Design a protein around this ligand. Structure first.
Ligand SMILES: CCCCCCCCCCCCCCC(O)O[C@H](COC(O)CCCCC)COP(=O)(O)OC[C@H](O)COP(=O)(O)OC[C@@H](COC(O)CCCCCCCCCCCC)O[C@H](O)CCCCCCCCCCCCCC
Ligand SMILES: CCCCCCCCCCCCCCC(O)O[C@H](COC(O)CCCCC)COP(=O)(O)OC[C@H](O)COP(=O)(O)OC[C@@H](COC(O)CCCCCCCCCCCC)O[C@H](O)CCCCCCCCCCCCCC
Ligand SMILES: *Cc1cc2c(cc1C)nc1c(=O)[nH]c(=O)nc-1n2C[C@H](O)[C@H](O)[C@H](O)COP(=O)(O)OP(=O)(O)OC[C@H]1O[C@@H](n2cnc3c(N)ncnc32)[C@H](O)[C@@H]1O
Ligand code: HEB
Ligand code: HEB
Ligand SMILES: COc1[nH]c(=O)c(C(=O)[C@@H](C)C[C@H](C)[C@@H](Cl)CCl)c(O)c1OC
Ligand SMILES: COc1[nH]c(=O)c(C(=O)[C@@H](C)C[C@H](C)[C@@H](Cl)CCl)c(O)c1OC
Ligand SMILES: O=C([O-])CC(=O)C(=O)O
Ligand code: SF4
Ligand code: SF4
Ligand code: F3S
Ligand code: F3S
Ligand code: FES
Lengths: 588, 238, 129, 113, 113, 113, 119, 129
């Protein structure tokens, strides 16, 4: 017994959109609770969110949540769960009105060039919905929503352990989850945070590529603890490549541009999206709009420049006002990273890695799921996940733009509202012996003793190069097949890696190293999944199976781990809600 | 070409007093990169070199740094803007705050003042709304240039009045925040907030030096806000 | 490090390192001019005292202002005073509402100031002599 | 309410400073106007200018204005640079006694003319 | 603590007013008693009444009392009728400079006799 | 902020007392030093010592210092022994008017020499 | 009583180096026997306004307790004319204290933290 | 007992009953000396007034200090003043940090005080005469 233990009734790994929403909510119910974060809470990736929060408020035009279900189901490609999607869309309106009462800087309706209305939150148009239901605070919605929640947590005096790095979860003799270990980046000391509920809210991790909209932070840490410990990982092949990123930068530019009237064109001046998606035009689903541009690039018919093979995003036709009022954020991101004032010229965009559908399979209440001998669903004791690392099965094969944030809050909060109940259901959980905890430090001790190994930059660069080619937008059996091997090489290679800096005071490297194991363990299952699925749906796009296998592949691909041992593969399903919704054609 | 750097170094467990270490980077001469980019490279050369960063697009406030005697964000300070032959590219921490390691300052007293001015809405709930709060665009317009701060700690870090009274004077970033809720239609404790700032230090340490405006990554103007807060003060207590 | 409790973190405060806007140079001087003018009144009251005391006193006063060492001083005072008044009025203009509180507007004011000050410093010297 | 500050709070200090400035401005102008219309100062022109009720009242309304103005400013400076409490209080004490004496000696000089 | 008010609070203003009233009352009586026992005022009787140490001290203790009293009252009025902030502060400034000058000119008049 | 106390709070009273003590100490020393070097006081030596600008300024800087010092002390006493509110306020009023007069009569005595 | 804002919770107990804990000696020992206060003229005159020797030792007890985080708040609360400043250093308190405690020494410290904060 | 509400408890406050330390005698006198000195200034300003008024006034002043009844008084004042200054300085010494705030240290100071005071009272009388 030599490690420090901080006992909490709860531990929330990650202080972003969903973490802070649940952190705040768990605190509400007189529950002791610690909230951890790799960076200062407001730096979390959620600040970069732009678009808005799509939710049927009925502010811009009459509406109803059901149209939100249909618009989403068709967006997931009938692989998203009706029960979760239902709850989410119904509980949506309130959940959001709620943030407005906390002070969220929403934009409002009234006097405009040709529009007028009271005070309600303004809803801009987004891809996947028939009209406008996307509530946003100009071009910076996420920045508004993250800061608001931090202010709330500031107010409701939540316990925050800023800049603390979670290492690995800690398993109970009876195979449960009783907390986790963590390094305080500042002091460099290590500590075990014991808790009756451990909530992963580690976010996404599109950093397993070379060009991503994500931050240097999204390094699957959540994924690589849920595996290193034994918990499955659903639809890990489902990666959303945002239609409009910045060429060479990866920096995103809100789909809200098309929502305000933006053009997605080719060098020959035509609107290939009006062609690819006849009636739904540039407002088409994510996956669809993605390939269309990536195609005019294989055919050698995509604009080029100092930036690279791209497609023009014309916005200059809108008002210089509408641009500075409704998209002030874009104007700066285009001028800086893309040397192109949008008010006078289109923007160099390319479909780049954005959102990460798959992640820890969880029920509405946020509890993490695994399988049984028969392959049944068996709730993991002490573990819950909410957010992006979570795969509650609400986005399926293709996340409908603007819903992520909605997910953050609705489920993050649901994770909180239901916690007391959940901890009851699982009953007490037994302590963890010096051995159980010791297990979680194994990864740490590795890097700290292996001082002569191999330079980690190469491994990272390789890990990113591969994943970029073999599993980009389009992919095929042999591709996956090849990289799926390059990986094993590197995954082993990575086992001899080294840690040059070994100091205590703010070891920037140790964290990046540590994040690496996670970047690896992630992309891995990613591949095993991408390959396994023999069908063409949403994000997943194979040339050997150009159509969706409705009978064999209408399910969730569940990657089965065993820590560092051998891997596997599996399935899961779900279409029994309340009003009922059947499969169909996907013509945007 | 070859790029020359002069960086601040300090490991409490190695160094018993700070120093500047020399760095060279033969970055491709095709185009220019961001100072963060440069930093990450040297980071590969030297792993003991540490600094903060994340969103990378100038929206998180992570890489707050003083480059060439002027504070700014590394993720967007073009190398162009820092290269001048013969001489080097100086890079030090943000002035004023305690240095944790190399170019990473303890942002303690910053966040501290942030809280003092109550960074959250305070509505007495009188006259509840049916759905959301009544907010005419004209009013909401008033929050522009206030809710955008990213707490990058650049301005406060560039204000003499802050270096002298970190703990008493609220500083530029907090004062913008104070004002953010002073003019929010939805905040009903305006008078209460005003009384809370009427001492000799909180607001009145500002002498209109303006380095804050001068350096703000997000183009915000703390001095203009402070002058307003001061004006609401005269209105209420004179 | 106190007594049996060690280590205190460094702080970046090398003022030769940091770079200051003109608007910063403008204020710092205003303050310095303030402290200068404070001592100044003492000297002036001393002189005004000698001045009115009687004819022998008036002479003795004139004779002191004769020295060129005195003139130089008597000139720096009037100049420090001058600076401080102008920039004070600038302050107040931004305090009420006769000046945009933007940065550019700030540099302009600051400049227009130094200019007026020098002009006034000039006349001051014309008088001192 | 800081015991070494003149004003009761910020707003008091801000306002007292500003008002005395204005008064102190007019007085300087008035004093500059005179001198700029003299050149050769005869003991007769000099002692005649201070004999004026108007000049005595302004001069002293100024000294009194400086006490208030300077007290506050100097308190503002010491407050920034002089961190050791004991040293600072002694400084405000010296400064204040100085300012008072300026005014008192002011009366003494004036009624003696 | 309103920065334009003299007193620190209500009770301070209430009390300062009342006390100066009493002082200002005695002074008036004393000044009325004199005049009511003079009729024909000879420059000799006049300048002899103000030559008295007692008369100089009371006269000035009054002027000082008026500053305090009137400052507060006039602040009370402007506070009611003059709603625009900028206009009012200028008024208190004019009024206060006026009251100070009353006292200062008071000394000047007195020691000159 | 007790309306009969001089200081705004404790710390203000504590400090104002202490500072005036020091000033009032130097003045006494200075006044003792003189007298201890005189013995036989000739109207010429006497009126010559008060004719000095230095002596007038100190004497009055003292009277002013006593007002502040004594006001606070006497307020401290009445506050302890004089429980009936009406009686006490009248006492502070008498005491304060007394202290003011000390200073004013001080000027009158001084400029008359 | 202790007033800790809970910011930066401890794992088990509170961080308290013997050097700091030493500061509580001569302060946590009072037995509330009411001897000193009962021997102080300033108390006889203002029982209700002046806090007295026993309370002032108690005030100081939490002013210098490493674990108490409302030190500034406590100080502002004692800055009136009566709470602390009625003490004139008569010393009957020290003179009589069964437990050998020294209220005057503590009060002088509290006064010193006051000048530090409001001057 | 108010009106139709009876009984009020007794309080032990017989000051002849209670026993006072020297440190208590020291303060009480300091206060008394304070109130004495307050009236004192009035008397002194009166005398200083007569003193400078003119030669007839100076004489009239000398003549008053002649009376031995006046001398006795003029002596008690200077003595009350004296006491009050010394013990004030004592106060301040403990206020800042030139004196241990322990009890013994307290009696010592108090004693050393009375001693200095008497010495000064002595000189005072030498002057008064
Ligand atoms: C809008 C903002 C307003 C601005 C505010 C800023 C004010 C500060 C800036 C000062 C500017 C001064 C400008 C003066 C000026 O204009 O000089 C004029 C020159 O004009 C030209 O050149 C024409 C060009 C026109 C172009 C269009 C007039 O100068 P002359 O020609 O008379 O030259 C003197 C001569 O040689 C003939 O000289 P002499 O032989 O008569 O000299 C004699 C000499 C010695 O006399 C004595 O012994 C008496 C000394 C008395 C000193 C009294 C000091 C009073 C202190 C009061 C303190 C109250 C608190 O005399 C000296 O050289 C005279 C010195 C004067 C210093 C005056 C300064 C007053 C400051 C007052 C306010 C102080 C406030 C303290 C807070
Ligand atoms: C470190 C701490 C500092 C201590 C602070 C404490 C101060 C109080 C203690 C007082 C101590 C006084 C000590 C005096 C002294 O030292 O006397 C000396 C004696 O020294 C020896 O004996 C040598 C021994 C050496 C051993 C080593 C000198 O005395 P002489 O020899 O001159 O004797 C007089 C002579 O007979 C010849 O006498 P004379 O014939 O000339 O007398 C004439 C007589 C009448 O003259 C008049 O009519 C004029 C009166 C003017 C009164 C003015 C009062 C001023 C009030 C100002 C108030 C301002 C607010 O003169 C009188 O006897 C003179 C009386 C003097 C009283 C002086 C008191 C001043 C108090 C000033 C501060 C007041 C503060 C109020 C808050
Ligand atoms: C990248 C991006 C994403 C995005 C967007 C724009 C950009 C540039 N615009 C969106 C929009 O308009 N609408 C929408 O619905 N989604 C949008 N997105 C996606 C969205 O930002 C994300 O899904 C969402 O931000 C995910 O939020 P979550 O709260 O789950 O995660 P967050 O990303 O950072 O925070 C994760 C937290 O966990 C901590 N963490 C991670 N690993 C660790 C370890 N090892 N130890 C301790 N803490 C860890 C982080 O520090 C962080 O607090
Ligand atoms: C014009 C008008 C005016 C005038 C005349 C003046 C005059 C004067 N003054 Fe002033 N001030 C002023 C206006 C003025 N002023 C102002 C406005 C200020 C402010 C500052 C701040 O805010 O910071 C000052 C401030 C101030 C100060 C402070 C510093 C700082 O900055 O902190 C001082 C010390 C002062 C002094 C003085 C003197 C000594 C004199 C002569 C008497 N000068
Ligand atoms: C040395 C210095 C000094 C001096 C000179 C003085 C001077 C004087 N003074 Fe003072 N005091 C003092 C120091 C002083 N002092 C002190 C320290 C005190 C305090 C007290 C207590 O704390 O209690 C007093 C206090 C006080 C008081 C209060 C009392 C009690 O104890 O409560 C009085 C009344 C007074 C008065 C006076 C007078 C009248 C005079 C003359 C001018 N004285
Ligand atoms: C008028 O206000 C101010 N304006 C300033 O430019 C300013 C400064 O910028 C300081 C670098 C100048 C100061 C006097 C240094 Cl040399 C002492 Cl170590 C400063 O300290 C200041 O006081 C708050
Ligand atoms: C200087 O402070 C003080 N020091 C004291 O010894 C003191 C006392 O001890 C009192 C017995 C003395 C007092 C004047 C009585 Cl005879 C009136 Cl009924 C007293 O009342 C006092 O005032 C608070
Ligand atoms: O949520 C989405 O995927 C849409 C988005 O990021 C944006 O419009 O900027
Ligand atoms: S106002 Fe600007 S510089 Fe200051 S903290 Fe905010 S974003 Fe950073
Ligand atoms: S006498 Fe001693 S033990 Fe009793 S109350 Fe006073 S300090 Fe406490
Ligand atoms: S730099 Fe500082 S003084 Fe106010 S003027 Fe800007 S915050
Ligand atoms: S007896 Fe009373 S005055 Fe303070 S000195 Fe001791 S508590
Ligand atoms: S890394 Fe986010 S603003 Fe610099």
């Amino acid at each position: 017994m030599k490690l420090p233990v901080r006992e909490f009734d709860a531990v929330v790994i990650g202080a972003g959109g969903a973490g802070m929403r649940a952190a705040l909510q768990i605190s509400q119910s007189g529950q002791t609770c610690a909230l951890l974060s790799k960076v200062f809470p407001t730096r979390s990736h959620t600040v970069s969110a732009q678009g808005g929060i799509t939710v049927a408020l009925g502010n811009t035009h009459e509406d109803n949540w059901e149209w939100h279900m249909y618009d989403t189901v068709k967006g997931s490609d009938y692989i998203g769960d009706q029960d979760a999607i239902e709850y989410m869309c119904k509980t949506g309106p309130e959940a959001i009105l709620e943030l407005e009462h906390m002070g969220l800087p929403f934009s409002r309706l009234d006097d405009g060039r040709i529009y007028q209305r009271p005070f309600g939150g303004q809803s801009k148009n987004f891809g996947g919905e028939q009209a406008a239901r996307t509530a946003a605070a100009a071009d910076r919605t996420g920045h508004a929503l993250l800061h608001t929640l931090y202010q709330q947590n500031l107010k409701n005096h939540t316990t925050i352990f800023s800049e603390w790095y979670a290492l690995d979860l800690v398993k109970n003799q009876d195979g449960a989850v009783v907390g986790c270990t963590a390094l305080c980046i500042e002091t460099g000391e290590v500590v075990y945070f014991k808790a009756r509920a451990t909530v992963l809210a580690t976010g996404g991790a599109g950093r397993i590529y070379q060009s991503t909209t994500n931050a240097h932070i999204n390094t699957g840490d959540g994924v690589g603890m849920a595996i290193r410990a034994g918990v499955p990982v659903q639809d890990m092949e489902m990666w959303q490549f945002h239609p409009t990123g910045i060429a060479g930068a990866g920096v995103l530019v809100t789909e809200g541009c098309r929502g305000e009237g933006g053009y997605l064109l080719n060098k020959h001046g035509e609107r290939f999206m009006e062609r690819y998606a006849p009636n739904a035009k540039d407002l088409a689903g994510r996956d669809v709009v993605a390939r269309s541009i990536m195609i005019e690039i294989r055919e050698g018919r995509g604009c080029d420049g100092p930036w690279g093979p791209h497609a023009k995003l014309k916005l200059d036709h809108l008002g210089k006002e509408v641009l500075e009022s409704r998209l002030p954020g874009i104007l700066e991101l285009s001028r800086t990273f893309a040397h192109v004032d949008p008010v006078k010229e289109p923007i160099p965009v390319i479909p780049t890695c954005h959102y990460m559908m798959g992640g820890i399979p969880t029920k509405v209440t946020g509890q993490a799921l695994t399988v049984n001998e028969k392959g049944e669903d068996v709730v993991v004791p002490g573990l819950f996940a909410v957010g992006e690392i979570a795969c509650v099965s609400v986005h399926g094969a293709n996340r409908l733009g603007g819903n992520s944030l909605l997910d953050l809050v609705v489920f993050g909060r649901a994770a909180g509202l239901h916690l007391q109940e959940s901890i009851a259901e699982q009953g007490a959980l037994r302590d963890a012996s010096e051995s159980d905890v010791e297990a979680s430090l194994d990864r740490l001790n590795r890097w700290n003793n292996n001082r002569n190994g191999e330079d980690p930059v190469a491994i990272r660069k390789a890990l990113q190069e591969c994943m970029q080619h073999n599993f980009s937008v389009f992919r095929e059996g042999d591709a996956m097949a090849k990289g799926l091997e390059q990986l094993k090489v590197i995954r082993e290679r990575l086992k001899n890696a080294r840690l040059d800096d070994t100091s205590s005071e703010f070891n920037t490297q140790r964290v990046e190293c540590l994040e690496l194991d996670n970047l690896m363990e992630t992309a891995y299952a990613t591949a095993v999944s991408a390959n396994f699925r023999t069908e063409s749906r949403g994000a997943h796009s194979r040339f050997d199976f150009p159509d969706r296998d409705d009978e064999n592949w209408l399910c969730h691909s569940l990657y089965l781990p065993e820590s560092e041992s051998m891997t596997r593969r599996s399935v899961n399903m779900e279409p029994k809600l309340r009003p009922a919704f059947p499969p169909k054609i996907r013509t945007y | 070409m070859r790029l020359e750097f002069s960086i601040y170094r300090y490991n409490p467990d190695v160094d018993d007093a700070p120093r500047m270490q020399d760095y060279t980077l033969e970055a491709d001469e095709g185009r220019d990169m961001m100072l963060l980019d440069a930093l990450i490279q040297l980071k590969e050369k030297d792993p003991s070199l540490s600094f903060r960063r994340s969103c990378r697009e100038g929206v998180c406030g992570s890489d707050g740094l003083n480059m060439n005697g002027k504070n700014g964000l590394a993720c967007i300070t073009p190398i162009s803007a820092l290269n001048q032959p013969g001489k080097k590219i100086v890079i030090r921490p943000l002035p004023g705050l305690p240095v944790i390691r190399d170019l990473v300052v303890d942002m303690g007293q910053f966040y501290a003042q942030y809280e003092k001015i109550k960074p959250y809405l305070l509505n007495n709930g009188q006259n509840p709304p049916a759905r959301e709060h009544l907010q005419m665009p004209e009013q909401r317009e008033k929050l522009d240039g206030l809710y955008e701060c990213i707490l990058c700690a650049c301005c406060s870090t560039s204000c003499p009045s802050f270096w002298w009274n970190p703990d008493k004077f609220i500083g530029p970033a907090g004062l913008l925040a104070a004002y953010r809720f002073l003019i929010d239609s939805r905040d009903t404790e305006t008078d209460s907030r005003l009384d809370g700032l009427s001492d000799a230090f909180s607001v009145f340490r500002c002498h209109s030096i303006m380095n804050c405006v001068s350096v703000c990554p997000k183009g915000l103007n703390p001095t203009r806000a402070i002058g307003h807060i001061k004006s609401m003060l005269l209105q209420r207590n004179a | 490090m106190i007594r049996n409790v060690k280590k205190q973190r460094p702080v970046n405060l090398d003022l030769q390192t940091i770079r200051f806007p003109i608007t910063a140079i403008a204020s710092i001087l205003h303050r310095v001019s303030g402290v200068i003018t404070f001592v100044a009144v003492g000297i002036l009251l001393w002189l005004l005292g000698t001045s009115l005391s009687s004819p022998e006193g008036f002479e003795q006063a004139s004779a002191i202002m004769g020295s060129f060492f005195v003139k130089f001083i008597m000139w720096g005072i009037l100049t420090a005073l001058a600076y401080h008044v102008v920039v004070g009025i600038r302050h107040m203009m931004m305090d009420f509402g006769y000046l945009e509180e933007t940065f550019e507007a700030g540099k302009r004011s600051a400049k227009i100031s130094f200019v007026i000050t020098v002009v006034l410093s000039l006349l001051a010297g014309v008088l001192v002599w | 309410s800081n015991a070494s500050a003149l004003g009761r709070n910020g707003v008091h200090d801000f306002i007292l400073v500003r008002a005395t400035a204005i008064v102190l401005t007019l007085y300087i102008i008035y004093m500059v106007g005179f001198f700029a219309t003299s050149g050769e100062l005869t003991y007769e022109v000099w002692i005649g200018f201070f004999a004026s009720a108007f000049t005595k009242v302004f001069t002293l309304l100024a000294l009194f204005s400086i006490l208030i103005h300077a007290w506050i400013g100097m308190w503002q400076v010491l407050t920034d640079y002089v961190k050791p409490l004991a040293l600072r209080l002694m400084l405000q004490l010296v400064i204040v006694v100085a300012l008072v004496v300026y005014v008192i000696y002011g009366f003494v000089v004036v009624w003696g003319v």
